Amino acid sequence: TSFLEYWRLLSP
Amino acid sequence: ETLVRPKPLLLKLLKSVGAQKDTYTMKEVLFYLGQYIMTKRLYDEKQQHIVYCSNDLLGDLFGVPSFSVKEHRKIYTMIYRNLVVV
Numbered sequence: 001t002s003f004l005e006y007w008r009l010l011s012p
Numbered sequence: 013e014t015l016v017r018p019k020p021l022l023l024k025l026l027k028s029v030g031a032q033k034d035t036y037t038m039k040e041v042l043f044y045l046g047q048y049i050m051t052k053r054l055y056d057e058k059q060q061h062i063v064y065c066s067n068d069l070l071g072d073l074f075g076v077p078s079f080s081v082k083e084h085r086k087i088y089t090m091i092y093r094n095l096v097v098v
Binding site: 001002003004006007009010011 | 081088
């Protein structure tokens, strides 16, 4: 999912 | 290392996707929250950064019926406002 990559830009 | 006790609403979101603890790391809160949106398919299928949660529990925690995951301040406002740090 391309969602998950967007969401990983939240962390660290 | 820094642990958090999520408040009742944010905890029900993490617990509703298979998480059973009460004290989390920031990595776990972000994992379980991202897993909540994916399991509930709250994302816009074509532009997966848009999240619809108007008829969802996430909308109560967020404040708005929709948000873009690129709005980091807005997402981190809901995260830290609904948790207790130790």
